[PDB]
Design an enzyme around this catalytic site. Structure first.
Site, mmCIF file in Angstrom:
data_model
loop_
_atom_site.group_PDB
_atom_site.id
_atom_site.type_symbol
_atom_site.label_atom_id
_atom_site.label_comp_id
_atom_site.label_asym_id
_atom_site.label_seq_id
_atom_site.Cartn_x
_atom_site.Cartn_y
_atom_site.Cartn_z
ATOM 1 N N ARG A 19 0.771 -1.105 -0.066
ATOM 2 C CA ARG A 19 -0.061 0.079 0.067
ATOM 3 C C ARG A 19 0.708 1.243 0.090
ATOM 4 N NH1 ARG A 19 -2.943 -2.008 5.364
ATOM 5 N NH2 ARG A 19 -0.882 -2.361 5.672
ATOM 6 N N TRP A 55 -3.203 9.968 10.381
ATOM 7 C CA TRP A 55 -3.020 9.365 11.657
ATOM 8 C C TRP A 55 -2.377 10.037 12.515
ATOM 9 C CZ3 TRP A 55 -3.788 3.565 12.805
ATOM 10 C CH2 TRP A 55 -4.844 2.996 12.237
ATOM 11 N N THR A 61 -0.518 -6.892 17.042
ATOM 12 C CA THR A 61 -0.600 -6.913 15.804
ATOM 13 C C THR A 61 -1.219 -5.645 15.157
ATOM 14 O OG1 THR A 61 -2.453 -8.419 15.274
ATOM 15 C CG2 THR A 61 -0.016 -9.377 15.488
ATOM 16 N N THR A 62 -2.268 -5.167 16.098
ATOM 17 C CA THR A 62 -2.968 -3.855 15.690
ATOM 18 C C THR A 62 -1.845 -2.843 15.463
ATOM 19 O OG1 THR A 62 -2.912 -3.002 17.958
ATOM 20 C CG2 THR A 62 -4.828 -4.460 17.479
ATOM 21 N N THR A 63 -0.614 -2.940 16.217
ATOM 22 C CA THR A 63 0.586 -2.159 15.865
ATOM 23 C C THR A 63 0.244 -0.871 16.972
ATOM 24 O OG1 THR A 63 -0.140 -0.417 14.575
ATOM 25 C CG2 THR A 63 0.966 -2.488 13.305
ATOM 26 N N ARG A 120 -8.286 -3.731 18.007
ATOM 27 C CA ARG A 120 -8.572 -4.950 17.625
ATOM 28 C C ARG A 120 -10.099 -5.439 17.401
ATOM 29 N NH1 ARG A 120 -5.027 -7.099 15.518
ATOM 30 N NH2 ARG A 120 -6.816 -7.029 13.792
ATOM 31 N N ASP A 151 -11.495 -3.548 13.972
ATOM 32 C CA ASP A 151 -10.589 -4.106 12.796
ATOM 33 C C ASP A 151 -11.192 -5.659 12.650
ATOM 34 O OD1 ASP A 151 -9.036 -4.874 10.870
ATOM 35 O OD2 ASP A 151 -7.609 -5.313 11.961
ATOM 36 N N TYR A 187 -12.802 3.324 10.802
ATOM 37 C CA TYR A 187 -13.705 2.154 10.618
ATOM 38 C C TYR A 187 -15.236 2.615 10.808
ATOM 39 C CZ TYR A 187 -9.765 -1.193 10.564
ATOM 40 O OH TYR A 187 -8.652 -1.683 10.287
ATOM 41 N N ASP A 217 -12.238 -0.703 6.392
ATOM 42 C CA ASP A 217 -11.055 -0.329 6.624
ATOM 43 C C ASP A 217 -10.549 0.940 5.703
ATOM 44 O OD1 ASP A 217 -8.320 -0.127 7.179
ATOM 45 O OD2 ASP A 217 -7.537 -1.850 6.307
ATOM 46 N N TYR A 236 -7.952 3.090 5.938
ATOM 47 C CA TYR A 236 -6.670 3.333 5.558
ATOM 48 C C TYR A 236 -6.443 2.624 4.265
ATOM 49 C CZ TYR A 236 -1.599 2.711 5.609
ATOM 50 O OH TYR A 236 -0.307 2.797 5.670
#
Length: 536
Positions: free
Chosen positions: A252, A261, A389-391, A429, A432, A508, A513, A515
């Site tokens: 991306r 963001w 893993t959402t960062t 989380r 998403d 969201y 999504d 982004y």
């Protein structure tokens, strides 16, 4: 190796942000006038003998106009006095606004203030159902509740149903403010986005608007927008020079979205350095994310993950050529961060972000392993991996890097996953997972959250969705309680975490999504915040 086919839409922005030359005469002109308007506004806030309702409206207006960051001390001194005098003799409108502003500022005002507006069962007097301003303020206040505020359990539903009913026949701009609030509450919105809307669509159209405040808000918004466009040009040039768009075509290309963001995390001019650091990180992990999801083989991702743990340029030769590209760039970026913080003697905190990045990558790899194994963990195990893993731990940590007053102690607090950070991550989380469930279910990803939920609890998709919804509601209450005094760190370091949660909600909205697919979602905000100035 036959990698997956590239299915990402290109950047929709081209090079329109690449070069921006500020008009110095316009900027200086604005800054000069803003100086006079800022003093006028300061004197408005310091005025004596104001009625409580007028004081709260003044503060709310100044906050919603996006100029409260000029008046932290004054607003805080005023709210502290209001909190201390604890007067309980007002209408719903004022009471709900009093409650929200104090809570949002960390003052744990009791929700007993709402008792007089309820009957013996704790149900709002349905005779309030025709008080639109009271309802609108009650509605906004309902979103700052904690776990101690069960007195407000019915507030959101009560105010929503009656505002929905009243809205079509309301005059403007009140109708637009109400309709907008029902779509996006103020407390969970991205501050610049809500400010841009409030200035342009609402306060500009209010019959009783304060002209000094409105003028101040427009000039200030447009002057900050100049700085933002400068930062974005700089980051655009940085991104273009890296040229991942050609050498890593699978990923991306979203530096503008990454910038948005960072702007959501903080918009104030003192966070210029912090924003630019943040956007570069968001951009880089985005490349990593795409590498695990839609390109790298099992073996390659194993190598990449191990290389990241070792964090050593010597490891590049163990990686496939395309992976060398991002790995070198990642290591370079953090050496640049360290160099950039050097003069402030703050190079030593960069390691906190590095360690969080390593965690994101470890867990990306675990997600990949689970996928190939067809593993469906119980929810607790699912979350122990999927939260990072959402960062969001990583981004929160990264957001502190360029904040001049962020100390080792602030990072240490954050390192222990405090409740407020944990809540923000959970919100990210579950939203998403909710959004992407059907998409990734057809993608064959058997380790989705909803799937883990259904199988763990023996429930349906709908029940799992609802349980995830409850986790987000619990997490928002934790965020609100996490803002309450006394704070474990300066408020300055809580707001980025709060703002990360807000960005999730906004990105969201309508369950897509934003982004990855900015068109419907982020594009309007980007135009509103970074392309169009507010017309004076």
């Amino acid at each position: 190796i036959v990698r997956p086919v590239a299915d990402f839409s290109p950047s929709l922005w081209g090079d329109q942000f690449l070069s921006f030359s500020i008009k110095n005469q316009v900027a200086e002109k604005y800054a000069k006038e803003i100086e006079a308007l800022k003093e006028q506004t300061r004197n408005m806030l310091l005025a004596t003998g104001m009625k409580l309702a007028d004081t709260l409206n003044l503060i709310d207006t100044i906050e919603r106009l996006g100029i409260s960051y000029h008046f932290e001390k004054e607003i805080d001194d005023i709210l502290d006095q209001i909190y201390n005098q604890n007067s309980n003799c007002n209408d719903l409108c004022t009471s709900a606004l009093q409650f929200r502003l104090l809570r949002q500022h960390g003052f744990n005002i009791s929700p007993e203030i709402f008792s007089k507006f309820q009957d013996e069962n704790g149900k709002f007097k349905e005779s309030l159902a025709s008080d639109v301003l009271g309802l609108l303020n009650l509605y906004e206040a309902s979103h700052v509740r904690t776990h101690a505020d069960d007195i407000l359990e019915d507030a959101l539903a009560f105010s929503t149903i009656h505002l929905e009913s009243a809205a079509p026949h309301l005059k403007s701009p009140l109708r637009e403010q109400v309709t907008h609030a029902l779509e996006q509450c103020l407390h969970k919105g991205v501050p610049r986005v809500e400010t841009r809307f409030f200035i342009s669509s609402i306060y500009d159209k209010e019959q009783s608007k304060n002209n000094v405040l409105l003028r101040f808000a427009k000039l200030d918004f447009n002057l900050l927008q100049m700085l933002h466009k400068q930062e974005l040009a700089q980051v655009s040039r940085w991104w273009k020079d890296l040229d991942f768009v050609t050498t890593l075509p699978y990923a991306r290309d979203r530096v503008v979205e990454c910038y948005f963001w960072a702007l959501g995390v903080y918009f104030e001019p003192q966070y210029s350095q912090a924003r630019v650091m943040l956007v570069k990180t968001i951009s880089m992990i985005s490349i990593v994310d795409d590498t695990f999801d839609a390109y790298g083989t099992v073996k390659e991702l194993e190598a990449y993950t191990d290389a990241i743990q070792r964090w050593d340029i010597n490891e590049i030769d163990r990686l496939p050529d395309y992976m060398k590209i991002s790995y070198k760039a990642i290591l370079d970026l953090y050496k640049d961060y360290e160099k950039e913080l050097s003069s402030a003697g703050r190079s030593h905190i960069v390691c906190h972000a590095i360690e969080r990045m390593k965690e994101v990558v470890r867990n990306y790899n675990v997600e990949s392993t689970w996928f190939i194994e067809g593993y469906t963990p119980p929810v607790s195990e699912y979350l122990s991996n999927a939260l990072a893993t959402t960062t969001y731990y990583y981004l929160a940590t990264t957001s502190y890097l360029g904040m001049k007053s962020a100390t080792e102690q602030d990072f240490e607090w954050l390192s222990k996953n405090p409740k407020i950070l944990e809540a923000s991550v959970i919100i990210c989380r579950v939203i998403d997972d909710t959004a992407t469930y059907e998409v990734e279910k057809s993608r064959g990803q058997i380790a989705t959250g909803i799937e883990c939920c259904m199988r763990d609890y023996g429930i349906s998709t709908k029940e799992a969705m609802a349980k995830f919804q409850n986790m987000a509601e619990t997490a928002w209450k934790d965020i609100n309680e996490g803002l309450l005094r006394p704070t474990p760190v300066s408020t300055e370091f809580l707001t980025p975490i709060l703002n990360l949660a807000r960005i999730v909600e906004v990105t969201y909205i309508h369950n897509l999504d934003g982004y990855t697919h900015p068109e419907k979602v982020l594009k309007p905000h980007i135009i509103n915040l970074l392309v169009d100035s507010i017309k004076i």
